[PDB]
């Protein structure tokens, strides 16, 4: 209810800063003039003079002065603010800020956000005084226009946050010591993926850590994936997890009079949450976790490592879009050379484009790689179709990792049965054999699911004639990779197939009985 035209802001500069010993009883190092909305009946000239008066008082007392417009939701106020606060900021040579645009973005995400941003507890409409999420979106804009400008990366689909200059973007606080650790760059080798990295960044903590970062999404519909580049001495079951909040701010108090409303809004802010792949598969690995959708504007990312680790490595983040993420291999028909001892990807890119660790995880192409796990597992569906079947001793490879030479095989063995197994840097020793011995050149489908309990990739194979089926194969070893072909037979053979990995969020069931 206070106005700049009244002289209230000018007077209470003294009373507010000099008169408050908790505020230091002195001029503040930074002084922000944020008034404007109340005064629209006052002349442009009048208001300009009041701004001049205010700025020079603050200048004289040693303050670094800024001027900020906080809201853009009123047609006339926008023009007024431009002619006074923006005008005087330029003329006086003081920094100008507008939080309005980001409020508009956050509040206009869909058909429901208008409620969350502008509807008061008494059920009335107010775009002048935004609700909790609105106040956060404004603060987020102010952060981006200050420290965020150099310390927060602006991202679009296709971008990656790597292990380089992590100290710019990440912190690493230990629990319970509360130590803020400093990143180190160490050379890594002795495993194919590490030889790709050459160097990773880490902290030596010997305790649980919380690694946080922020990114600014330039577009709606964006997504994020997690790379845990070296799971060192981790043990399966530890509570490693990750969480994304957007918009960002001081969390509402989960207590008091408005505990329910506050819990509701915080939950709404939390757009992603769950266990990482490391929690499923343990140490000595390099693992990828699909997470899901982000929000336009500022996103807060909190990453927890459990089990009191000696070394804690910073993760990398890959950004995509929910409109294109997945794996999409349209129908292809191609021959492969005989006497192979190693599966080969159906569709390759240049090594400069993808060296097979993280860059093409669920990127949604004919070149894409699956992920080891999802934040929301047991909700996605891998699908392979081999319409004209396969020759004997000929197989399709699923989740094949050319770097580690590990993947799943499915096809027709020498005896003419269907079979599925784990190619673990050698021909499988865990073959699951099924159906009659006449499976050559007969079509089948393969469906892949994941367990939200174990992280295991479970496979169901069904011949088109309905005679040969199995779901008896499951793996926690060949959990991600590319589609490949394998021809260990003595003759060149044709392979016809398509593959698609569809991402889901709500868990789905896929069981039926023999009846």
Instruction: Report the site for Cl ion in 10-49 (rule: CB under 5 A).
Output: 38-39, 41
Q: Pick from a copy of itself, Cl ion, none: which does 165 bind, CB < 5 to 8 A by kind?
A: a copy of itself
CB within 8 Å of 440: residues ≥ 6 apart? 389, 390, 391, 392, 412, 416
What's the closest the beta carbon of residue 289 comes to a copy of itself, in angstroms?
15
> In this complex, which beta carbon is closest to a copy of itself, that of residue 4 or of residue 238?
4
CA 444, chain centre distance (Å): 35
Residues contacting 309, CB < 8 A, separation 6+: 205, 206, 207, 208, 209, 232, 233, 234
> Which residue, 67 or 371, is less far from Cl ion as judged by CB?
67
Residue 222 β-bridge partners: 321
Which does residue 433 touch among a copy of itself, Cl ion, none (CB within 5 to 8 A, set by kind)? none
Smallest separation, CB 512 to a copy of itself (Å): 5
Closest approach, Cβ 247 to Cl ion, in A, equals 23
CB of 190 to a copy of itself, least distance (A): 14
Instruction: Specify the residue, 1 or 60, whose C-beta has the smaller distance to Cl ion.
Output: 1
Q: Taking CB within 5 to 8 Å according to partner kind, which of Cl ion, a copy of itself, none is near residue 39?
A: Cl ion
The listed partner (a copy of itself, Cl ion, none) that binds 44, CB under 5 to 8 Å by sort, is: a copy of itself
Residue nearest to Cl ion (CB): 41
CB of 222 to a copy of itself, least distance (A): 8
Residues with Cβ within 8 Å of 218's Cβ and at least 6 positions away in sequence, in order, are 154, 155, 156, 296
**Contact status: 228 vs Cl ion (CB under 5 A):** no
Least Å distance, CB 374 to a copy of itself, is: 14
Which is closer to a copy of itself, CB of 201 or CB of 208? 201
Q: Which is nearer to a copy of itself, 2 or 510 (CB)?
A: 510
Identify what 205 binds: a copy of itself, Cl ion, none; CB under 5 to 8 Å per kind: none
Q: Select the binding partner of residue 506 from a copy of itself, Cl ion, none (C-beta < 5 to 8 A, by kind).
A: a copy of itself
CA distances from 271 to 45, 133, 135, 347, 381 (A): 46, 13, 18, 34, 22
Question: DSSP string of 134-165?
Answer: HHHHHHHHHHHTTTHHHHSEEE-TT-EE-STT
Closest to 4 measured CA to CA, from 59, 62, 57:
57
Backbone dihedral region of 343: left (phi > 0), alpha (psi from -120 to 50 degrees) or beta? beta
In the complex, minimum distance from the CB of residue 141 to Cl ion, in angstroms, rounded to a whole number: 20
Q: Which does 365 bind (CB under 5 to 8 A by kind): Cl ion, a copy of itself, none?
A: a copy of itself
The least CB distance from residue 261 to Cl ion, in Å, is 23
Q: After which residues is the chain broken (C to N over 2.5 A)?
A: none
> What stretches of 337-480 adopt beta strand conformation (E)?
344-345, 373-374, 381-386, 394-401, 406-412, 418-424, 432-434, 444-450, 457-463, 469-475
Nearest CB to a copy of itself, comparing residues 324 and 454: 324
Instruction: Please identify, among the stretches 1-9, 131-139, 282-290, 401-409, the one whose residues bind Cl ion according to the rule CB under 5 A.
Output: 1-9
User: Measured between alpha carbons, how far is 474 from 281 in angstroms, rounded to an integer?
Assistant: 14
The rounded distance, in Å, linking the Cα atoms of 497 and 394 is 13
Residues 41-100 contacting Cl ion, CB under 5 A: 41
- Nearer CB in complex with Cl ion: 41/255: 41
Q: Minimum CB separation from Cl ion for residue 41, in Å?
A: 3
CB of 363 to Cl ion, least distance (A): 40
Choose between 38 and 500: whose C-beta lies nearer to Cl ion: 38
Residue 162 partner contact from Cl ion, a copy of itself, none using kind-dependent CB cut-offs of 5 to 8 Å: a copy of itself
Decide: 227 and 355 in contact? Cβ < 8 Å.
Answer: no
Nearer to a copy of itself, 69 or 417 (CB): 69
CA distance 489 to 296: 52
Return d(Cα 103, Cα 117) in angstroms, integer. 9
**Burial category of 329 from C-beta neighbours within 10 Å (exposed 0-12, middle 13-18, buried 19 and up):** buried
Give 13 or 376: the residue with its C-beta nearer to a copy of itself. 376
Tell me if residue 104 falls in helix, strand or coil.
Answer: helix
- To Cl ion, the closest distance from the beta carbon of 128 in angstroms equals 8
Cβ–Cβ under 8 Å, residues 275 and 375: yes
Containing 214, the helix (H) or strand (E) segment is strand 208-217
> If contact means CB under 5 to 8 A according to the sort of partner, which of Cl ion, a copy of itself, none does residue 511 touch?
a copy of itself
The entry of a copy of itself, Cl ion, none that residue 403 binds, CB within 5 to 8 Å by partner kind: none
Contact of residue 52 among a copy of itself, Cl ion, none (CB under 5-8 Å per partner type): none
Which residues are 374's β-sheet partners? 290
Closest CA to 271 of 250, 254, 249, 247: 247
Residues near Cl ion (CB under 5 A) are 1, 38-39, 41
């Amino acid at each position: 209810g206070k106005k700049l035209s009244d002289g209230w802001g000018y007077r209470n500069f003294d009373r507010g800063f000099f008169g408050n010993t908790r505020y230091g009883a002195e001029a503040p190092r930074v002084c922000i003039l944020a008034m404007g909305w109340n005064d629209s009946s006052a002349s442009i000239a009048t208001y300009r003079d009041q701004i001049d008066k205010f700025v020079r008082k603050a200048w004289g007392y040693g303050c670094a002065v800024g001027i900020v417009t906080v809201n853009d939701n009123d047609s006339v106020r926008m023009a007024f603010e431009l002619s006074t606060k923006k005008y005087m900021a330029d003329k006086l040579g003081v920094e100008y800020f507008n939080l309005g645009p980001n409020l508009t973005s956050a509040s206009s995400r869909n058909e429901q956000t208008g409620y969350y941003y502008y509807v008061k507890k008494d059920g009335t409409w107010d775009t002048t005084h935004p609700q909790e999420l609105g106040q956060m979106a404004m603060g987020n804009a102010m952060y981006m226009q200050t420290l965020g400008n150099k310390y927060c990366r602006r991202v679009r689909p296709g971008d990656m946050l790597t292990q380089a200059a992590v100290e710019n973007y990440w912190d690493c606080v230990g629990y319970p010591s509360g130590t803020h650790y400093a990143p180190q760059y160490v050379p890594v080798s002795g495993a194919p993926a590490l030889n790709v990295f050459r160097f990773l960044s880490k902290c030596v903590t010997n305790e649980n850590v919380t690694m946080t970062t922020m990114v600014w999404c330039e577009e709606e519909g964006m997504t994020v994936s997690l790379l845990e580049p070296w799971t060192n001495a981790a043990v399966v079951g530890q509570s490693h997890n990750i969480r994304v909040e957007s918009p960002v701010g001081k969390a509402l108090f989960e207590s008091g009079e408005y505990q329910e409303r506050n819990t509701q809004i915080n939950a709404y802010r939390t757009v992603l949450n769950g266990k990482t792949a490391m929690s499923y598969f343990g140490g000595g690995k390099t693992l990828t976790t699909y997470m899901g959708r982000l929000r336009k504007g500022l996103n807060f990312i909190r990453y927890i490592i459990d089990g009191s680790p000696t070394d804690a490595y910073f993760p990398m983040l890959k950004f995509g879009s929910y409109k294109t993420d997945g794996v999409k291999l349209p129908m292809v028909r191609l021959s492969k050379e005989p006497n192979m001892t190693r599966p080969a990807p159906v569709m390759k890119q240049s090594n400069a484009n993808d060296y097979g660790v993280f860059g093409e995880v669920l990127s949604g192409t004919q070149f894409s790689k699956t992920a080891d796990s999802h934040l929301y597992n047991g909700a996605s569906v891998g699908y392979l179709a081999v319409p004209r079947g396969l020759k004997k001793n000929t197989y399709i490879a699923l989740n094949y990792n050319p770097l580690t030479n590990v993947g799943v095989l499915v096809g027709v063995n020498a005896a003419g049965n269907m079979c599925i197994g784990t190619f673990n840097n050698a021909n499988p020793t865990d073959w699951v054999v099924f159906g009659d011995t006449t499976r050559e050149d007969k079509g089948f489908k393969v469906w892949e699911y994941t367990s939200s309990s174990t992280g295991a990739h479970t496979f169901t194979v069904e011949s088109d004639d309905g005679t040969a089926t199995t779901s008896a194969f499951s793996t926690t070893v060949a959990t991600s990779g590319y589609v490949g072909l394998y021809n260990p037979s003595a003759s060149s053979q044709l392979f016809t197939l398509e593959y698609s990995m569809t991402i889901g969020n709500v868990g789905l069931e896929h069981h039926h009985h023999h009846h």
